[PDB]
Ligand binder design. Sequence first.
Ligand SMILES: COc1ccc(C(=O)n2c(C)c(Cc3ccccc3O[C@@H](C)C(=O)O)c3cc(OC(F)(F)F)ccc32)cc1
Ligand SMILES: COc1ccc(C(=O)n2c(C)c(Cc3ccccc3O[C@@H](C)C(=O)O)c3cc(OC(F)(F)F)ccc32)cc1
Lengths: 255, 253
Amino acid sequence: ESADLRALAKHLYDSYIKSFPLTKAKARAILTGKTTDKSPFVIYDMNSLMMGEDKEVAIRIFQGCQFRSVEAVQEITEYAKSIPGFVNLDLNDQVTLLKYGVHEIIYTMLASLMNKDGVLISEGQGFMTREFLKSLRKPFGDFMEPKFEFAVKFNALELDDSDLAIFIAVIILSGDRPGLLNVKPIEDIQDNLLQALELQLKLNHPESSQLFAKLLQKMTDLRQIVTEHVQLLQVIKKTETDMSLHPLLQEIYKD
Amino acid sequence: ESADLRALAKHLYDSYIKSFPLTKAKARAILTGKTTDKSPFVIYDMNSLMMGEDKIKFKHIKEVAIRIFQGCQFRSVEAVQEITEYAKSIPGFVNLDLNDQVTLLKYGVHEIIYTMLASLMNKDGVLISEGQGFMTREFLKSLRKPFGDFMEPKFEFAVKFNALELDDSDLAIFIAVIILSGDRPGLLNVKPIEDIQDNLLQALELQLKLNHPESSQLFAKLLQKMTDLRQIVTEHVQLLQVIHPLLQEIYKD
Ligand SMILES: COc1ccc(C(=O)n2c(C)c(Cc3ccccc3O[C@@H](C)C(=O)O)c3cc(OC(F)(F)F)ccc32)cc1
Ligand SMILES: COc1ccc(C(=O)n2c(C)c(Cc3ccccc3O[C@@H](C)C(=O)O)c3cc(OC(F)(F)F)ccc32)cc1
């Protein structure tokens, strides 16, 4: 049964590597100056942003964020389908779980791209500083800061990709999403994923059941970040009428 | 090393029994009607509420919805003291920095209140006045504009949490784990807090393995419930923000 849980952990890690082209391993190699990977161009003000290439800045960056979130949804959906039992659930419930899980997973994976000083962009080819993002016209200057605050706390856990692979699967398989039809089979899958994560942490860390506990708490941080984020989106919708969310993102955010 | 985790589990149980008069065991017996004599007074509508006030010894008594909410506030202030007494019996707690003890309790009590409230609830209602009364879920659900959904999220949580079928033995260690959280804002010395919580978590794991040997997933499931509690609390304060100077002082939280 431990063996079943190890097999589940390995299946998930394999799918994660296959689904997500920029891993924490690669992000940390880029950020810490390892010779496996290359150095990013750093955008820290308006001039270096202009040089960054090769209708205002805040809006331009936001449309970029939108493009990469759309791709992330695609990657996460591919990953979700590999979680044993997911594709056998009622279709309505598959959609509900993805709708609520996608952004919580986005914030989780975004942390891998961040340190306290900024975030990797353009597949790790650029690095945009936290202070630059903060300087952006209101309320765009408020978007990324809560993500940074979360990322710094999440990254202190020092998880690697193999831990994250199971953690993300646990997120998607939440039986407490609004509007679910059959909660029991979702919870049955999550119970196994939770045990797989528990054992994975037990083998890989350091005070593992406490790490387990601290990691599970991050869900709450995640759902709070999402709530605060949609509120910001509502402001944007009202003040920037020449702008709207990509149809996929609109659908995710609808109710 | 298994023996000192059992010794710790036992100390916590004994202290939990001392601190909290109405145990889950006694509460479930009242809720199932296994208690052969003292059937609780049932509050299912406005008239039965008013009669309940006449018969039971209430200590908090203009509008029914306000009056019930005020009774809940009185009870919670009582519970904070019960929980505080319990916390001081957790090995290591009184040796923490004094500010940190205060900080752990400040953020910890509501999560514990919710956990313990679940012991008093079934899907149909909740025990009041140490089991002397029973207030139905539908009567609560029927209350005024903002007060009708005050208890619903507590019930929904309680129904799921009670499905784990924890007994007082399990809950004693579980509550100690919640209090000893190293991620509360403004903690000065997190290391010994997390050292104690690590020990409590190991004691909780063994306890669940011994008391529920047929459910290997229970520990994981319980830890996940710890996180639900923080969400419910956040949800509860956003409800409170929507909702006699000396009384304001007594009930500042
Ligand atoms: C889950 O997998 C992934 C998660 C994230 C990404 C990705 O790297 N990002 C992704 C998906 C984003 C966009 C983004 C991040 C967090 C929250 C929201 C968000 O986009 C908005 C439009 C949204 O989806 O509501 C992003 C932003 C970045 O910084 C910038 F400086 F540009 F603002 C940097 C990287 C970003 C790629 C894959
Ligand atoms: C931690 O130990 C205890 C935990 C709970 C109690 C307790 O039984 N209750 C306690 C503490 C309460 C009030 C209460 C419970 C959960 C969350 C909030 C709450 O009150 C509000 C006003 C608050 O504290 O902000 C309570 C309410 C009950 O239902 C009623 F019909 F009154 F609305 C019934 C029992 C209640 C006593 C001790």
